[PDB]
From Swiss-Prot:
Organism: Homo sapiens (Human)
The protein's assembly and partners: Monomer.
Keyword Nucleotide-binding: yes
EC annotation from Swiss-Prot or TrEMBL: 6.3.3.2
Residues where substrate binds: L54, E59, R146, G147, K148, G149, Y150
Gene coding for it: MTHFS
Protein name (Swiss-Prot/TrEMBL): 5-formyltetrahydrofolate cyclo-ligase
């Protein structure tokens, strides 16, 4: 019952948030602001092994950050989701240009296909820094995802491979910042956002 009330609150907020999620140019504008903030960010600059998402249209565009990741010689991993469940791995990509050749999911997001053998981040040391996607975030680092809980489960696996947990950095539109995100689940270290 209390569980259902939480679910209801999340569902309502998701609706409210997805409504808010803007022009194409404003999305690009705000993505450019965040990329600069990211490139200037201490945790990002120091990170050696990085997980980053490939942007949907209701998400901060990560294209510029991906270019920079490879320029800084970081080891770059992207999501590969198993849609049958809440399982995801982070799989290694070797250049920004590789992304353009990948097959795409029903979300129109690139990820390596079923027969494509990939280095999984947890097989080779884990991650220093994970960029956290989501529908909404509050100033306490509470995250509202799409409902499937992939990132929550992934973070718990990271604990089994690393003495120190990966730093988690959320990238948000101004429109994605909420007063209170209803919660059960796992906070992000920092939410970046502004005009
Ligand atoms: Mg927007
Ligand atoms: Mg976008
Ligand atoms: Mg699948
Ligand atoms: Mg997993
Ligand atoms: Mg393709
Ligand atoms: Mg697999
Ligand atoms: Mg609010
Ligand atoms: Ni992995
Ligand atoms: Ni797997
Ligand atoms: Ni998730
Ligand atoms: Ni509060």
């Amino acid at each position: 019952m209390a569980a259902a009330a939480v679910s209801s609150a999340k569902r309502s907020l998701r609706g409210e948030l997805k409504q808010r999620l803007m022009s194409a140019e404003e999305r690009l504008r705000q993505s450019r602001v965040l990329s600069q903030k990211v490139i200037a960010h201490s945790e990002y600059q120091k990170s050696k092994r990085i997980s980053i998402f490939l942007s949907m249209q209701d998400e901060i565009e990560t294209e510029e950050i991906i270019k920079d990741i490879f320029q800084r010689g970081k080891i770059c991993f992207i999501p590969r989701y198993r849609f049958q469940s809440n399982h995801m791995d982070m799989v290694r990509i070797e250049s920004p240009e590789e992304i353009s050749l990948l097959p795409k999911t029903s979300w129109n997001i690139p990820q390596p296909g079923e027969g494509d053998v990939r280095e999984e981040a947890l097989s080779t040391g884990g991650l220093d820094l994970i960029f956290m996607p989501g529908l909404g975030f509050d100033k306490h680092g509470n995250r509202l995802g799409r409902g499937k809980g992939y990132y929550d489960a992934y973070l718990k696996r990271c604990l089994q491979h690393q003495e120190v947990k990966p730093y988690t950095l959320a990238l948000a539109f101004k429109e994605q910042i909420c007063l209170q995100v209803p919660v059960n689940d796992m906070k992000v270290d920092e939410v970046l956002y502004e005009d």
